[PDB]
Symmetry: C4
């Protein structure tokens, strides 16, 4: 659990994300570490990334000297304080999720895998300018009882116990997003599973 092993995984998650069709050189990834977090830097294209580029931001919000952390670092810190169990955070502007956040809609229970994020929906937190404390509060309120949330006019945040499951979850919500937009263009509303049905699935997971 050294710093470089964690930094290598961050980078591999970036590469993997790009390969899955979710990143477009616009996302950012972090892990919980010591009293704060390790995050991707702003400005460096993912493919030029080396272990030594990863940035440490302490619990007070102070970042390592001579390194610029991602421009969206503040809602990574908000996630870690709102959800003590989260150890990794994945943010991207995946097209389908983002398109659903532009309609300012929550993703309802159109598929039983919606339970991976913890309930019968994927919420859409309200718009606030990237990098602000106001955006950070909306994110913290949306992650109180869900592991993933849309961000109106912006994209997605997913958190989990490690980077593997956070990427897995991020991908699953982009599939759910795609399903909802594809079915919504044909019929409105979209048929959903009942709350009873989701409660069984939750128990089963």
């Amino acid at each position: 659990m050294e710093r470089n092993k964690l930094a290598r995984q961050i980078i591999d998650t970036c590469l993997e994300m790009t390969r899955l069709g979710l990143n477009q050189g616009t996302g950012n990834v972090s892990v919980r570490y010591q009293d704060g977090m390790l995050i991707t830097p702003t400005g460096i294209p993912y493919e030029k990334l080396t272990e030594s580029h990863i940035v440490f931001i302490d619990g007070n919000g102070k970042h390592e000297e001579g390194k610029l952390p991602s421009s969206e670092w503040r809602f990574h810190m908000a996630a870690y304080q709102s959800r003590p169990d989260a150890n990794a955070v994945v943010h991207n502007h995946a097209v389908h999720c983002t398109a659903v956040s532009i309609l300012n809609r929550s993703i309802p229970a159109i598929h039983y895998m919606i339970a991976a994020a913890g309930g019968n929906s994927i919420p859409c937190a309200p718009y606030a300018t990237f990098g602000t404390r106001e955006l950070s509060e909306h994110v913290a309120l949306a992650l109180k009882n869900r592991k993933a949330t849309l961000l109106q006019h912006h994209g997605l945040i997913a958190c989990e116990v490690n980077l593997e499951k956070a990427l897995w979850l991020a991908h699953e919500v982009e599939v759910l997003a795609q399903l909802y937009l594809t079915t919504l263009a044909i019929t409105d509303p979209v048929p959903v599973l009942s709350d009873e049905e989701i409660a069984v699935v939750l128990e089963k997971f």
Copy 2:
């Protein structure tokens, strides 16, 4: 026809499936073997899979010691008992097929390749919680006269004589799914080939 050759093929089918855009670390593949089947395990990402991870489940539903078979193993066993000719089963949550299963619609004869699954349609079996005996019965009734079926709010099952044709068929039904949703957004109903026309194509295959 040793166990490892069959296990290697299962793994290659997983890899291939992921490369074709159908799997997203959510499907499961099996082959008929001895008195039961060889299936993919639950919990291991496809890329960490080795021959020794594949799980044997006998005809009584008893799985090898210290191995966890996929969570969806019961409808693989239902397929093998409903269709004696099936020797391999491919299940995934391919986006277009799944989107059609959310509208709870059958895929009708919009293209002459619908005959690869054995008739003039791809049915949609009703919803039941994953991993249950009730889901297993719906699957068994849907595969009685077709080689592939949608599963409402869930995804797809395809079966054939070997893994090569089962993957081939699974991919073909995802193309058919895509065609139907793309045309359905423009016009409802979608023009179909007549039953007479499908009967000629069937004979020809």
Copy 3:
């Protein structure tokens, strides 16, 4: 211009086609040769293809001994007799083109690249069972004044002077297909360029 050099190119065109997202192990490719043509065989997956699998079919429709030519060989021969200038033929079931052939619509002049196929449209020939003489006649009538045509409920045929341009053209018509279906879901009709405008573009090419 030996037989093996031509057979190697056929195979590379198959591989390339699959890489571009047009083939799904359902198309077939040919080249004009001697008094007939060299075509891909039926039944062999593209990746197992070797120079020695390619099939020669003479001008009388007689194929080499102990080799099965593609099941769709007859409209390849129809193309060569209807268009003396065509030296290669590419057929596939590319999703967007096929979706447009299911609406039984011609692709009109929504983009100036429609002139690559020779006019102000990409026609849609009427349905007839694959592999028949009736299908062959519709194809021959559609290619009289165009280098590419849709085939209702089926897919696409493109022909050109060599395999490079036939694949290039096939890809361009799949892009045109995608543009038309994407715009058609928003507005019906789709704005087009006037015949005057297409006549200038034609002259320019």
Copy 4:
């Protein structure tokens, strides 16, 4: 900043563009150089491109002897004269952008990344035959206060300080295009961010 280093980058941008899903052997790339520019040649498929194929066109519009510059070179020269700060130009026929240019619509502020191109929109310049002086004037007027523009019934032009950012920007506008068409099929108008909101984002960048 030798000529070959610049020629190598042009080629890599072509390759990269094709890998991102934007090019289809139809775009063209240039860099500002000496008194004119270095551009891709017409007729050579991107994968056969070598440093020695790149063409130099002076400020008078005279191209190197025995080399044919792209057929769309004139609006590359128009870009360089309309925007002194642009050092690289990327043009392609990316499907979503092109589909939006067929509806002859501007892309409005549906996402905060619209500010990368310099304002609250991505304009759509009017149609004129490829390769003409009339097309060149529309492009010059559209790039006066934006770094990217759609071209009605045609595709996209993006310019920036270097090739890296010009490709990055071109990709971002294709994502914006996709978002707008996907949301437009569900609801018309598409919710946008207010001008006040975009003014803050602009300041922040």
